[PDB]
Write an enzyme that holds these catalytic residues in place. Structure first.
Site, PDB file in Angstrom:
ATOM      1  N   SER A  85      84.100  36.177   2.859  1.00 38.71           N
ATOM      2  CA  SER A  85      82.948  37.073   3.014  1.00 38.71           C
ATOM      3  C   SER A  85      82.365  37.452   1.636  1.00 38.71           C
ATOM      4  CB  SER A  85      83.358  38.319   3.797  1.00 38.71           C
ATOM      5  OG  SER A  85      82.245  38.889   4.477  1.00 38.71           O
ATOM      6  N   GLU A 113      80.385  32.532  13.043  1.00 33.84           N
ATOM      7  CA  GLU A 113      80.431  33.565  12.002  1.00 33.84           C
ATOM      8  C   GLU A 113      80.015  34.944  12.505  1.00 33.84           C
ATOM      9  OE1 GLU A 113      81.981  33.413   9.330  1.00 33.84           O
ATOM     10  OE2 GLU A 113      81.945  31.366   8.585  1.00 33.84           O
ATOM     11  N   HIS A 153      84.361  35.242  12.267  1.00 34.31           N
ATOM     12  CA  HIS A 153      84.436  35.656  10.876  1.00 34.31           C
ATOM     13  C   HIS A 153      85.845  36.088  10.485  1.00 34.31           C
ATOM     14  CE1 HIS A 153      82.073  36.443   7.332  1.00 34.31           C
ATOM     15  NE2 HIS A 153      82.620  37.635   7.176  1.00 34.31           N
TER      16      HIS A 153
HETATM   17  C1  LIG Z   1      81.547  55.294  10.117  1.00 38.17           C
HETATM   18  C2  LIG Z   1      82.266  54.589  11.269  1.00 38.17           C
HETATM   19  C3  LIG Z   1      82.871  53.258  10.812  1.00 38.17           C
HETATM   20  C4  LIG Z   1      82.052  52.074  11.332  1.00 38.17           C
HETATM   21  C5  LIG Z   1      82.497  50.760  10.677  1.00 38.17           C
HETATM   22  C6  LIG Z   1      81.397  50.205   9.744  1.00 38.17           C
HETATM   23  C7  LIG Z   1      81.426  48.669   9.732  1.00 38.17           C
HETATM   24  C8  LIG Z   1      82.004  48.039   8.455  1.00 38.17           C
HETATM   25  C9  LIG Z   1      82.019  46.501   8.468  1.00 38.17           C
HETATM   26  C10 LIG Z   1      82.309  45.856   7.088  1.00 38.17           C
HETATM   27  C11 LIG Z   1      81.351  44.682   6.779  1.00 38.17           C
HETATM   28  C12 LIG Z   1      82.098  43.398   6.441  1.00 38.17           C
HETATM   29  C13 LIG Z   1      81.371  42.144   6.901  1.00 38.17           C
HETATM   30  C14 LIG Z   1      80.512  41.510   5.815  1.00 38.17           C
HETATM   31  C15 LIG Z   1      79.122  41.147   6.316  1.00 38.17           C
HETATM   32  C16 LIG Z   1      78.142  40.707   5.225  1.00 38.17           C
HETATM   33  O1  LIG Z   1      78.343  39.646   4.596  1.00 38.17           O
HETATM   34  O2  LIG Z   1      77.150  41.429   4.987  1.00 38.17           O
END
Ligand SMILES: CCCCCCCCCCCCCCCC(=O)O
Ligand SMILES: C[C@H](CCC(=O)O)[C@H]1CC[C@H]2[C@@H]3[C@H](O)C[C@@H]4C[C@H](O)CC[C@]4(C)[C@H]3C[C@H](O)[C@]12C
Ligand SMILES: C[C@H](CCC(=O)O)[C@H]1CC[C@H]2[C@@H]3[C@H](O)C[C@@H]4C[C@H](O)CC[C@]4(C)[C@H]3C[C@H](O)[C@]12C
Ligand SMILES: C[C@H](CCC(=O)O)[C@H]1CC[C@H]2[C@@H]3[C@H](O)C[C@@H]4C[C@H](O)CC[C@]4(C)[C@H]3C[C@H](O)[C@]12C
Ligand SMILES: CC(=O)N[C@H]1[C@H]([C@H](O)[C@H](O)CO)O[C@@](O)(C(=O)O)C[C@@H]1O
Ligand SMILES: CC(=O)N[C@H]1[C@H]([C@H](O)[C@H](O)CO)O[C@@](O)(C(=O)O)C[C@@H]1O
Ligand SMILES: CC(=O)N[C@H]1[C@H]([C@H](O)[C@H](O)CO)O[C@@](O)(C(=O)O)C[C@@H]1O
Ligand SMILES: CCCCCCCCCCCCCCCC(=O)O
Ligand SMILES: CCCCCCCCCCCCCCCC(=O)O
Ligand SMILES: *[C@@H]1O[C@H](CO)[C@@H](O)[C@H](O)[C@H]1NC(C)=O
Ligand SMILES: *[C@@H]1O[C@H](CO)[C@@H](O)[C@H](O)[C@H]1NC(C)=O
Ligand SMILES: *[C@H]1O[C@H](CO)[C@@H](O)[C@H](O)[C@H]1NC(C)=O
Lengths: 532, 532, 532
Positions: B201, B334, B447
């Site tokens: 990622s 993904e 992913h």
């Molecule tokens: C505040 C409540 C919590 C909610 C959880 C938020 C979600 C976090 C996810 C992490 C993103 C990781 C994935 C990468 C995606 C990308 O490449 O942009």
């Protein structure tokens, strides 16, 4: 065509072109070029450090903030001195160490025009560089105009009297700006070998201080002081400053156990907290009650031992230093309306009598520094004339104006002369059309009045008569010529005698012509009286 | 035996031995070796500085804190990606610049095994190195595994667009960790001359950025990107970042007078105040209302002029740089479940229609960056198939997954190939048994699914079938082999063709076998559409 | 005829002349000469940095502040130890790194008299240099007396056990003060080549530490320890100090996530906040309840790896270092009244029994460090004598006094001897008339009782009998002579044998005469018992 992109030591700078009608070659204007690292955090109350290099092209196209000051007083002054059409509303920030450049040179080719660095005034308490537009002067006289800024008030002059906070930070900023010019102006078609410094009021006092300072040596080749020198006591603090430091510290809610403690505490204060402190200390306004000898005017130049090795008086008493062409001048009525009004002077009545006169002169101690025992003699020497109460008020205003600028200026000029360096003096006598509406039609040649001719205000504002448009053209010619050869003279301009033994000086105004011994009588009198 | 004590440049380090059943030589595990000076106080929003030397033996036996981030989201991700039995509860602290080492080498003798530095993912907003256990990979393939950490969110990517806070602090931390490896890994039986970087990622996007960065030159000799490259727009901020900086500043209760002012103010904020600011900004969550082009997704990689001299696109358009074996891969789905579930995508319905599709694709702007005028064409090209509402949702999930990883990855791979360097691609297609219970059993190769094979999860967790246990053994073989010779191939493994003109790539999963032109159709389509 | 003005490396210093009746040449007294940069702000918990140079003449005519500490306890001690007429009320400030100089040399001529640097005591938690007036010693023995100060408590000894805050800041300050002397004392008629360090209690322990420290090498040529050495466990923290750091951090309202975090948080606390923390900790007062092994009596000397490479015990077990004349002495009743009275010891009853004895000895763990299993044996060896409950109290006080000073001192003396360097020992046995009123008249040679003879208190205070006036003259002769030749002897004084194999030592007091094997029995016993 395409925005000007100069390459400086710290990185490429982007500006904008601006054409002054009547001139082909448009002037390249750069706004906000940083000449020092933002004196934030621990860098507060310490000398200015070099700026960090930038990776790409920096856009110098937005007016930089003005050093933290009293917003009201600040903007007020900016509107009264500005020579441009509209007054540019400025922002306040400790991050203010910037400078503006106005180059009429065709950057496409190698140019080395004379450089003129402007130091704005404002009692070292308020002020900004953006207030003064250089477009006209730069084009009209084909010289590079540089308007710099420097820390004000607490931020630039707080001194504990020792190594824990020597002070004169502001003066060091001016020097720093000067070093930047020596290492970069050449990229703006300016000749680093021909840099002329000039300023009005506090800026003049600064120009005078830089002249006496060893640090400024070789950073400029000509100097001009407009209504203000190093002998203008009100701006140079002598004696023990420790008490003032402590008073500020407390007002800022700090301890005063030791210098270091004070300095550390103040470095903790927020820009905002120190701004409030500033207002509380009520500077730039004359205290009416209490003891006149305790009404501290406005933090200022001290004898830190770095910038100034000793008091101006002592320094000028020597002919063993680097000398350069110096032009020192004053205006007909320095205390005519501007300063008196701002300081909120009690003259609200319209007239004044011998009794109330000696009273005001006393409370005006922080400005003229006249012993209460001398008050009588001084008052009599000036108001002892007509019994006209209204005239006494006018003669009274002349009293102050002489002690603050008249006598000091001439004394400095003489010493610079006796030192063996090209000296020149003038007395601006003209009432600009750009004056304030609340300025009496009577007051002609008030404080800062020459600023409109010097910066070609007639070529930026509207309504200027052909007389004013012409006066401006002349003054700029003189100033520029001086910047060039260290001599104001030039074909097409009245003869300006050199302030030598004859003490010849030029009377600038609607009627420009030479004269002799400026304030000669005054200098003599005050010298005796003050010698107790 | 007796606890492992290695000698590093900055001082002796103490670790612990851990045996992976089936292997004699126990692996030496070091947890929390600092590779930089805690970026606290004024060091915030500045490049990482060398660590201070310690006087005696430092105990690297406790999991280091994870960089300040959303605690919830952070731990959630840590539990979903961890390959170890129990999830290790981590602490939050700005003091997080540490790295963990897993060496299978018999420290008693001179060993120089290949080194593999792992860059965890988490959209540069969350994540930790301790999440990934290297015990299995280190033992199973006899290579030194290094898991590093780097500043996240504001702390590691706040940029004012200029020299007052260029940004990419996080990326500089990764480089810093790489330099540390070159100067110390040799004391951990690792060969500083054979360092392979790899991540998933954002970790992949980072690996891709390090590959384009001049600073990273000579810090690694092989690179692997797992589901993420420099062409993944959601992680690279192009254009003027100044507006984002200002929005953060305000959200943090700061002034925005000037860049310097902003930076200074934020350095004053407490770790805790900036953490709340982070929650307010609500990154990681797709905004549903307002203007999709104003929903800043997350702070990321910028073109500071130090790490990246220009946009990735421009950079890869050159064959005049240091090239190394690069392995870029993606997973079947993904955007299958993980990413959407985290960002809270309004697909709980179960299906989707052409109309609501074009809607979501629009609000998904900060992820796919598709002009509203193109939305129609894109939608039709993917969902225009079956009228099955349920299938349109899936096809929709394929739409996003292609724009974020599919097309970007292949484009990068091609350029690395045309550059003249060994290129390899793969497409992981398998549903690990260690998946979440809330993940539909229909989603295969979601992913982060390969992370379990790559880190031999089957050898640390329980329940893995012989099929999974075998898959893992293979992937590790491939990865390790690559780290060694810059070529995944090796007797005992299917043939992995080199991504050359034939564009051959390996299809990893229950059925591993080569194939050709990965996402070829997609790359072509999107290239045209986006070119409008 | 004019205030003394010396020129130091950092700038001119101004002092004042003071004549001690009976002496012609008046002594030049300098109060408050800074030897280090105020350890304020981020400089806290870091080594001392050089002072900033001053531009003009600095007035060293005002007693400098004393390092932050419990004001009550501080002033109390200052009044009980001061040798001057009136006790000087001191100010508290983190800005305390100053030193006072007392030079009897005629500054008008080149003088190079021996220098004696005094390190005040106060358990490394309280104390000040201004407490000890050097006017008498300086004049009476014609030597330059220097009283220095060093960070106390948290400010000078907070250690996290690692590079993030090694500790011993206080000891580094003492070294810093010593370097200053080597680079300036010569301007005060002092010979930088003949510097003798000496202190009482913690000052003695410091002198002993400086003797073992590589950093102090070549900064002094003679050392004297009065009631206190590096073997005085109470002032030397061994083992993991991390727990103490954490306990302080919490008490200060800080997090303890990591060392760095702790240090950063504490640097944020105000002088005042840390002062309250100090008071909350209660260090002076011996804890009566809870576990005696958890009542941290201090913040003291640690083995940072910079000042001390290993524990004193280990260090003295070597004859491969720079050796100098060392004079180590003790008083008849070290735990007579002073110390016990401050720690509010529960001896108010007047007597003590075997049972309550073993109890107190246990709770006195942080002072004697006697295993609870050894308590019985120790108690019996001392109180097993007369059944007189009142005498048991007395014998009990001897018990503690031996473990804290008696045995430690002799052990150190022996090793210094066996090392091959001039060693000398003494046992002050006299009850000064300047003692406290609440001090029983049966206590002779209490803790610090020699301080009045060493600093010629009889020549500053009033009421001293001719016997005391004489004793003082003697001690000073001895001390001064030692500073000079590294040998106390000199015509006009009893013979002081060198502490060699015969273990001869001088018994100082109303009856001064040599003797042998000091605390020989004790050393032997305690060595066995402690060896379990
Ligand atoms: C505040 C409540 C919590 C909610 C959880 C938020 C979600 C976090 C996810 C992490 C993103 C990781 C994935 C990468 C995606 C990308 O490449 O942009
Ligand atoms: C602006 C007004 C003239 C009326 C008009 O032009 O129509 C004039 C008349 C009286 C003036 C005031 C009086 O002359 C008394 C003061 C004189 C000082 O020199 C300036 C402030 C001072 C307080 C003046 C302010 C302003 O110039 C006033 C108020
Ligand atoms: C979390 C929830 C389970 C119900 C519960 O825990 O109480 C499940 C049930 C419906 C699921 C959603 C639906 O299956 C529709 C989508 C299917 C995609 O493969 C993942 C996203 C997707 C948007 C799913 C997210 C999440 O797994 C949901 C919302
Ligand atoms: C000061 C007072 C004498 C009264 C007087 O001189 O008028 C004496 C008498 C009893 C003394 C106390 C008792 O002797 C019991 C303790 C004996 C220890 O050696 C000192 C503390 C100790 C707690 C003493 C403190 C102080 O010396 C006291 C309180
Ligand atoms: C802070 C701000 O928004 N104003 C402008 C500032 C200032 O112009 C400079 O600091 C000089 O004042 O920087 C830019 O010009 C620039 O360098 O690209 C962009 C920006 O628009
Ligand atoms: C108190 C704390 O949290 N720090 C732990 C560290 C960590 O390993 C480092 O922070 C890196 O993780 O290790 C120690 O043993 C050590 O350095 O001697 C102390 C403690 O156990
Ligand atoms: C308030 C305070 O403590 N500062 C005093 C100092 C100290 O005496 C010295 O720093 C030694 O303490 O002396 C001065 O005269 C000086 O050095 O110029 C200033 C002031 O009187
Ligand atoms: C509308 C009333 C506002 C209050 C006015 C505040 C006073 C401002 C003073 C302006 C500074 C000019 C003083 C010049 C002093 C000097 O250097 O000679
Ligand atoms: C809350 C703590 C502050 C209280 C001040 C601590 C008082 C300590 C007593 C004075 C020092 C004299 C004792 C010598 C110590 C020793 O070396 O054993
Ligand atoms: C900087 O100025 C150039 C020239 O006008 C312009 O193209 C660019 O957008 C500006 N950049 C910023 C910071 O706005
Ligand atoms: C320093 O003290 C001396 C007298 O001891 C005096 O001459 C001088 O004024 C003092 N300096 C200051 C500014 O305090
Ligand atoms: C390292 O120091 C830690 C903390 O003091 C301690 O627990 C440990 O005994 C030392 N090394 C080991 C793991 O034995």
């Amino acid at each position: 065509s395409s925005p000007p992109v100069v390459d400086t030591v710290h990185g490429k700078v982007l500006g904008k072109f601006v054409s002054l009608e009547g001139f082909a070659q448009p002037v390249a204007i750069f706004l906000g070029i940083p000449f020092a690292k933002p004196p934030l955090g621990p860098l507060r109350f310490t000398p200015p450090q070099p700026a960090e290099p930038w990776s790409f092209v920096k856009n110098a196209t937005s007016y930089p903030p003005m050093c933290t000051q009293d917003p009201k007083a600040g903007q007020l002054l900016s509107e009264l001195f500005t020579n441009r059409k509209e007054n540019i509303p400025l922002k306040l920030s400790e991050d203010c160490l910037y400078l503006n450049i106005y180059t009429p040179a065709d950057l496409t080719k190698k140019n080395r025009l004379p450089v003129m660095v402007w130091i704005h005034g404002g009692g070292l308490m308020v002020g900004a560089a953006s207030t003064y537009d250089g477009l006209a002067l730069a084009a009209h006289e084909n010289v590079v105009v540089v308007t710099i800024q420097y820390r004000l008030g607490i931020w630039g002059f707080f001194s504990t009297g020792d190594e824990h906070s020597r002070g004169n930070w502001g003066h060091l900023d001016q020097v720093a700006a000067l070093r930047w010019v020596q290492d970069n102006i050449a990229s703006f078609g300016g000749n680093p070998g021909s840099v002329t410094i000039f300023g009005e009021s506090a800026g003049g006092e600064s120009v005078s201080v830089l002249v006496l300072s060893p640090l400024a040596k070789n950073l400029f080749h000509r100097a001009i002081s407009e209504s203000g020198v190093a002998l203008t006591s009100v701006l140079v603090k002598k004696g023990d400053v420790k008490p003032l430091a402590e008073q500020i510290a407390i007002t800022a809610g700090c301890k005063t156990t030791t210098s270091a403690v004070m300095v550390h505490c103040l470095r903790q204060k927020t820009e905002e907290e120190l701004l409030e402190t500033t207002l509380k200390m009520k500077f730039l306004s004359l205290d009416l009650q209490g003891d006149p000898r305790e009404s501290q005017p406005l933090l200022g130049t001290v004898i830190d031992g770095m910038l100034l090795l000793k008091t101006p008086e002592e320094l000028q008493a020597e002919r063993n230093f680097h000398t350069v062409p110096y032009m020192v001048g004053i205006n007909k009525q320095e205390f005519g309306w501007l300063i008196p009004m701002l300081m909120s002077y009690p003259l609200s009545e319209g007239q004044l009598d011998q009794k109330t006169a000696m009273s005001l002169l006393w409370k005006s101690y922080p400005l003229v520094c006249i012993a209460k025992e001398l008050i009588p003699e001084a008052t009599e020497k000036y108001l002892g004339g007509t019994d006209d109460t209204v005239k006494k008020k006018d003669l009274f205003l002349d009293l102050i104006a002489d002690v603050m600028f008249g006598v000091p200026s001439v004394i400095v000029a003489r010493n610079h002369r006796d030192a063996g360096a090209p000296t020149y003096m003038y007395e601006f006598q003209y009432r600009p059309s750009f004056s304030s509406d609340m300025k009496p039609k009577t007051v002609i040649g008030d404080h800062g009045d020459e600023l409109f001719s010097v910066f070609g205000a007639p070529f930026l504002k509207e309504g200027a008569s052909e007389e004013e448009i012409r006066l401006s053209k002349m003054v700029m010619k003189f100033w520029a010529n001086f910047a060039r050869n260290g001599n104001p003279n030039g074909e097409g301009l009245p003869h300006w005698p050199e302030y030598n033994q004859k003490e010849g000086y030029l009377q600038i105004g609607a009627n420009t012509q030479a004269a002799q011994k400026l304030k000669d009588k005054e200098v003599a009198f005050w010298t005796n009286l003050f010698a107790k």
